[PDB]
Amino acid sequence: SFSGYLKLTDNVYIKNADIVEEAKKVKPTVVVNAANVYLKHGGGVAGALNKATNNAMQVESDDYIATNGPLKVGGSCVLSGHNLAKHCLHVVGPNVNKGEDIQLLKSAYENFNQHEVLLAPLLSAGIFGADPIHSLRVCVDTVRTNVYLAVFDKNLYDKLVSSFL
Numbered sequence: 001s002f003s004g005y006l007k008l009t010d011n012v013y014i015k016n017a018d019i020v021e022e023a024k025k026v027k028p029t030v031v032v033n034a035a036n037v038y039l040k041h042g043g044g045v046a047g048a049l050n051k052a053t054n055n056a057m058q059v060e061s062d063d064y065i066a067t068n069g070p071l072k073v074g075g076s077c078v079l080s081g082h083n084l085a086k087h088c089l090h091v092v093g094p095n096v097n098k099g100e101d102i103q104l105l106k107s108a109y110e111n112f113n114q115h116e117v118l119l120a121p122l123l124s125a126g127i128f129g130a131d132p133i134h135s136l137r138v139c140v141d142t143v144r145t146n147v148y149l150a151v152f153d154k155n156l157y158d159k160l161v162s163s164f165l
């Protein structure tokens with residue numbers, strides 16, 4: 001199914017790739033979105049996944065929020081994967097630029113354990129402002145199911161690999 005991944009642990013794998021491109025190729029059962037509590041898919045991974053759905057993901061998401069209200073930081077919901085995947089798991093990692101508590105990162109990753117296999121980004125990295133190296137440590141220390149991590153930036157990929165303990 002997946003390919004070109006480096007194995008980090010028994011269950012965690014990583015690759016230098018565009019998560020949208022990976023999703024489009026693999027069409028996995030579950031792709032993880034790096035969402036906010038409003039499911040406003042404006043930038044980063046969410047902006048790119050949404051754009052690849054021709055905005056279908058935002059329309060669905062808007063209906064979800066109208067019905068159920070916002071998520072919590074550290075929480076998730078399962079929505080349609082649209083053209084990218086069977087399902088999308090929207091997970092809200094803390095945004096430290098908004099002062100959100102980093103301890104909620106472990107909670108965010110715990111969501112992954114409800115799914116046997118996921119394609120995912122590193123949570124709370126990029127514009128969420130946390131250190132990607134930390135994020136990856138929490139990932140491997142929390143996730144017990146099979147996770148294929150897509151890291152867009154090659155320099156960051158190299159640093160994550162070369163620094164992995």
Ligand SMILES: Cn1ccc2c(-c3ccc(C(=O)N4CCOCC4)o3)ccnc21
Binds near residue numbers: 018121126152
């Ligand atoms: C299409 N697309 C957009 C984001 C993204 C990611 C992802 C999340 C965080 C990083 C990351 O590599 N950074 C971005 C630039 O340097 C800072 C952190 O990668 C994973 C896969 N595809 C993606």
